[PDB]
Design an enzyme around this catalytic site. Structure first.
Site, PDB file in Angstrom:
ATOM      1  N   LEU A  53     -20.633 -50.957  67.416  1.00 24.79           N
ATOM      2  CA  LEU A  53     -20.378 -51.649  65.745  1.00 24.79           C
ATOM      3  C   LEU A  53     -18.869 -51.239  65.765  1.00 24.79           C
ATOM      4  CD1 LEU A  53     -23.786 -51.285  63.920  1.00 24.79           C
ATOM      5  CD2 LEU A  53     -23.248 -53.466  64.990  1.00 24.79           C
ATOM      6  N   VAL A  56     -18.320 -47.379  64.290  1.00 23.88           N
ATOM      7  CA  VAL A  56     -19.080 -46.103  64.200  1.00 23.88           C
ATOM      8  C   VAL A  56     -18.411 -46.056  65.989  1.00 23.88           C
ATOM      9  CG1 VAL A  56     -21.508 -45.355  65.987  1.00 23.88           C
ATOM     10  CG2 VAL A  56     -21.581 -46.607  63.843  1.00 23.88           C
ATOM     11  N   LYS A  63     -24.760 -38.177  66.602  1.00 26.33           N
ATOM     12  CA  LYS A  63     -25.549 -37.980  65.119  1.00 26.33           C
ATOM     13  C   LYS A  63     -27.233 -39.162  65.252  1.00 26.33           C
ATOM     14  CE  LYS A  63     -21.960 -35.315  62.668  1.00 26.33           C
ATOM     15  NZ  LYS A  63     -21.607 -34.866  63.305  1.00 26.33           N
ATOM     16  N   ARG A 140     -31.132 -47.013  36.853  1.00 23.72           N
ATOM     17  CA  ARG A 140     -30.392 -48.464  37.245  1.00 23.72           C
ATOM     18  C   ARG A 140     -30.803 -49.557  36.170  1.00 23.72           C
ATOM     19  NH1 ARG A 140     -27.550 -48.717  41.473  1.00 23.72           N
ATOM     20  NH2 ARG A 140     -28.552 -50.714  41.847  1.00 23.72           N
ATOM     21  N   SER A 171     -21.066 -55.109  40.629  1.00 20.96           N
ATOM     22  CA  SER A 171     -22.693 -55.790  41.202  1.00 20.96           C
ATOM     23  C   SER A 171     -23.668 -56.476  40.554  1.00 20.96           C
ATOM     24  CB  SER A 171     -24.000 -54.204  41.244  1.00 20.96           C
ATOM     25  OG  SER A 171     -22.979 -54.096  40.271  1.00 20.96           O
ATOM     26  N   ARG A 174     -22.309 -60.138  42.246  1.00 27.85           N
ATOM     27  CA  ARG A 174     -22.280 -60.009  43.431  1.00 27.85           C
ATOM     28  C   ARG A 174     -24.598 -60.302  43.361  1.00 27.85           C
ATOM     29  NH1 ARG A 174     -20.017 -54.658  44.062  1.00 27.85           N
ATOM     30  NH2 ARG A 174     -22.041 -54.715  44.187  1.00 27.85           N
ATOM     31  N   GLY A 180     -25.521 -50.293  38.905  1.00 34.51           N
ATOM     32  CA  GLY A 180     -25.557 -48.967  38.264  1.00 34.51           C
ATOM     33  C   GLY A 180     -24.647 -48.833  36.790  1.00 34.51           C
ATOM     34  N   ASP A 181     -23.744 -49.712  36.798  1.00 36.18           N
ATOM     35  CA  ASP A 181     -23.194 -49.330  35.330  1.00 36.18           C
ATOM     36  C   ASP A 181     -22.847 -51.115  34.669  1.00 36.18           C
ATOM     37  OD1 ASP A 181     -21.438 -50.808  36.634  1.00 36.18           O
ATOM     38  OD2 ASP A 181     -21.085 -48.765  37.004  1.00 36.18           O
ATOM     39  N   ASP A 247     -17.634 -50.538  32.127  1.00 32.07           N
ATOM     40  CA  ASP A 247     -16.085 -50.348  32.203  1.00 32.07           C
ATOM     41  C   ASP A 247     -15.481 -51.718  31.832  1.00 32.07           C
ATOM     42  OD1 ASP A 247     -15.529 -47.812  33.580  1.00 32.07           O
ATOM     43  OD2 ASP A 247     -16.382 -49.092  35.057  1.00 32.07           O
TER      44      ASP A 247
HETATM   45  N1  LIG Z   1      -9.638 -52.007  45.826  1.00 32.46           N
HETATM   46  C1  LIG Z   1     -10.357 -50.664  45.379  1.00 32.46           C
HETATM   47  N2  LIG Z   1     -12.063 -51.467  44.426  1.00 32.46           N
HETATM   48  C2  LIG Z   1     -12.825 -50.556  43.350  1.00 32.46           C
HETATM   49  C3  LIG Z   1     -13.310 -49.500  43.858  1.00 32.46           C
HETATM   50  N3  LIG Z   1     -14.110 -49.056  43.350  1.00 32.46           N
HETATM   51  C4  LIG Z   1     -14.351 -49.996  42.554  1.00 32.46           C
HETATM   52  N4  LIG Z   1     -13.825 -50.827  42.715  1.00 32.46           N
HETATM   53  C5  LIG Z   1     -14.146 -52.228  41.762  1.00 32.46           C
HETATM   54  C6  LIG Z   1     -15.557 -53.411  43.041  1.00 32.46           C
HETATM   55  C7  LIG Z   1     -16.496 -52.975  41.854  1.00 32.46           C
HETATM   56  O1  LIG Z   1     -16.731 -53.821  42.731  1.00 32.46           O
HETATM   57  C8  LIG Z   1     -15.712 -52.510  40.521  1.00 32.46           C
HETATM   58  C9  LIG Z   1     -16.351 -51.909  39.473  1.00 32.46           C
HETATM   59  O2  LIG Z   1     -16.967 -51.087  40.082  1.00 32.46           O
HETATM   60  P1  LIG Z   1     -18.378 -49.807  39.925  1.00 32.46           P
HETATM   61  O3  LIG Z   1     -18.086 -48.380  41.105  1.00 32.46           O
HETATM   62  O4  LIG Z   1     -18.992 -49.873  39.449  1.00 32.46           O
HETATM   63  O5  LIG Z   1     -19.859 -50.748  41.857  1.00 32.46           O
HETATM   64  P2  LIG Z   1     -20.431 -51.881  41.660  1.00 32.46           P
HETATM   65  O6  LIG Z   1     -20.446 -52.563  40.753  1.00 32.46           O
HETATM   66  O7  LIG Z   1     -19.990 -52.967  42.851  1.00 32.46           O
HETATM   67  O8  LIG Z   1     -21.786 -51.309  41.939  1.00 32.46           O
HETATM   68  P3  LIG Z   1     -22.830 -50.549  41.210  1.00 32.46           P
HETATM   69  O9  LIG Z   1     -22.101 -50.883  39.701  1.00 32.46           O
HETATM   70  O10 LIG Z   1     -22.948 -49.289  40.890  1.00 32.46           O
HETATM   71  O11 LIG Z   1     -23.732 -51.468  40.582  1.00 32.46           O
HETATM   72  O12 LIG Z   1     -14.340 -51.823  40.688  1.00 32.46           O
HETATM   73  C10 LIG Z   1     -11.565 -48.946  44.706  1.00 32.46           C
HETATM   74  O13 LIG Z   1     -11.969 -47.915  45.623  1.00 32.46           O
HETATM   75  N5  LIG Z   1     -10.758 -50.055  45.251  1.00 32.46           N
HETATM   76 MG   LIG Z   2     -20.486 -51.662  38.047  1.00 30.73          MG
HETATM   77 NA    NA Z   3     -17.392 -48.575  67.337  1.00 32.12          NA
HETATM   78 NA    NA Z   4     -18.009 -49.543  36.669  1.00 28.58          NA
END
Ligand SMILES: Nc1nc2c(ncn2[C@H]2C[C@H](O)[C@@H](COP(=O)(O)OP(=O)(O)OP(=O)(O)O)O2)c(=O)[nH]1
Ligand SMILES: [Mg+2]
Ligand code: NA
Ligand code: NA
Ligand SMILES: [Cl-]
Ligand SMILES: [Cl-]
Ligand SMILES: [Cl-]
Ligand SMILES: [Cl-]
Ligand SMILES: [Mg+2]
Ligand code: NA
EC number: 2.7.7.7
Length: 326
Positions: A53, A56, A63, A140, A171, A174, A180-181, A247
């Site tokens: 993949l 990897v 590992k 969560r 998320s 999606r 998570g937030d 956010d």
């Molecule tokens: N280009 C880039 N975008 C990011 C990065 N981190 C987060 N984002 C964007 C994509 C995330 O889906 C979105 C919201 O950030 P979050 O930390 O809340 O992640 P997400 O909502 O996807 O998952 P979660 O909140 O943990 O359920 O911001 C990054 O390191 N680079």
């Molecule tokens: Mg989020």
């Molecule tokens: Na590989």
């Molecule tokens: Na966020």
DNA sequence: CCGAACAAGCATCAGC
DNA sequence: GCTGATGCTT
DNA sequence: TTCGG
């Protein structure tokens, strides 16, 4: 989760390299391997199979062989024993404490949740709020709660100005069964890449959500990005809901599609897509996709009228949000 | 082997 | 105060 | 740590 033991192992290694070693490329390498393995639709039987993949390599394959053979990774078993590494790893779980502050706190003898609470005066504002809600921010959010939060945010935004459009991304967009937030993209026709015809566009929304006691705390706040805390209202005699991270990102209205692609993620999906753009001669941020010239300097923004337009430029088939959870 | 590895807003600090 | 680097975060 | 050239 065909391969949950392997992906858990790789995530723990990623966290070690980020939090303890401050080795960001090893952290990215482990996270990318975990992501590609999480997507792999067979139960992995060998490191050789996994090495086929992308992401990897030889070291991770070895590992995986150790993990499949024994159920364990000696390297992690000893990281788990190391007091300094364990404390540093723990402290970074507080929002606003990263690898540098965590190692400095550990140097000063601040190594436990108890230590942090006694030394609030050594925390900046963001870290202080991260400590206050340390437990809540670990939990969560059920999608049913996300739906209730969406309804509040969208309606309160509408009461400020009917021309605002708030879109829940992350998320949630999606299709995740839990998040998570909460991530909210905001537009207003007064704010474009050409002009800002009205000030305080983000502030007024934040203020309104504070007025109705939805936003409870602020971690950071500027003209276009708010990072803070919110809470659903609870009924009579009911236990309160946990406080939640929120956010908000105000994006120029003519740049909505680049912004909604950025804010829908995932983070690893964005890294992969942006890396592919570069290989295709483009650069993508939350505002624009621009071609790279002969010297590698970004050119002028390309026209974008849909998320799919961005995928087309880099010669990717379109992927719906639900297939971007990398 | 070796350079690249996504992109950027906000908080904080050092230096002037 | 402003500028630029650094940390932390999305 | 991995990959491409
Ligand atoms: N280009 C880039 N975008 C990011 C990065 N981190 C987060 N984002 C964007 C994509 C995330 O889906 C979105 C919201 O950030 P979050 O930390 O809340 O992640 P997400 O909502 O996807 O998952 P979660 O909140 O943990 O359920 O911001 C990054 O390191 N680079
Ligand atoms: Mg989020
Ligand atoms: Na590989
Ligand atoms: Na966020
Ligand atoms: Cl590294
Ligand atoms: Cl283990
Ligand atoms: Cl756009
Ligand atoms: Cl731009
Ligand atoms: Mg590369
Ligand atoms: Na942290």
């Amino acid at each position: 989760t065909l391969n949950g033991g392997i992906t858990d192992m790789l995530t723990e290694l990623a966290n070690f390299e980020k939090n303890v070693s401050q080795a960001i490329h090893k952290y990215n390498a482990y996270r990318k391997a975990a992501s590609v393995i999480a997507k792999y639709p067979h139960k992995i039987k060998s490191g050789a199979e996994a090495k086929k993949l992308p992401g990897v390599g030889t070291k991770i394959a070895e590992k995986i062989d150790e993990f499949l053979a024994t159920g364990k990774l000696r390297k992690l078993e000893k990281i788990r024993q190391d007091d300094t590494s364990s404390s540093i790893n723990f402290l970074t779980r507080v929002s606003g404490i990263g690898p540098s502050a965590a190692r400095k706190f550990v140097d000063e003898g601040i190594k436990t949740l108890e230590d942090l609470r006694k030394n609030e005066d050594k925390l900046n504002h963001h870290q202080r709020i991260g400590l206050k809600y340390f437990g809540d921010f670990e939990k969560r959010i059920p999608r049913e709660e996300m739906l209730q939060m969406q309804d509040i945010v969208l309606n309160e935004v509408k009461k400020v100005d009917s021309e605002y459009i708030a879109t829940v991304c992350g998320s949630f967009r999606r299709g995740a069964e839990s998040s998570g937030d909460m991530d909210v993209l905001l537009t207003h026709p007064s704010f474009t890449s050409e002009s800002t015809k009205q000030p305080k566009l983000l502030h007024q929304v934040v203020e309104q959500l504070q007025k109705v006691h939805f936003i409870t705390d602020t971690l950071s706040k500027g003209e276009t990005k708010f990072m803070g805390v919110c809470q659903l209202p609870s009924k009579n005699d009911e236990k309160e809901y946990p406080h939640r991270r929120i956010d908000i990102r105000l994006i120029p209205k003519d740049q909505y599609y680049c912004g909604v692609l950025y804010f829908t993620g995932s983070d690893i999906f964005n890294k992969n897509m942006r890396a592919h753009a570069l290989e295709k001669g483009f650069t993508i941020n939350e505002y624009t996709i621009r071609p790279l010239g002969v010297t590698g300097v970004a050119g002028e923004p390309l026209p974008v009228d849909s998320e799919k337009d961005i995928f087309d430029y880099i010669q990717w088939k379109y992927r719906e949000p639900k297939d971007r959870s990398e």
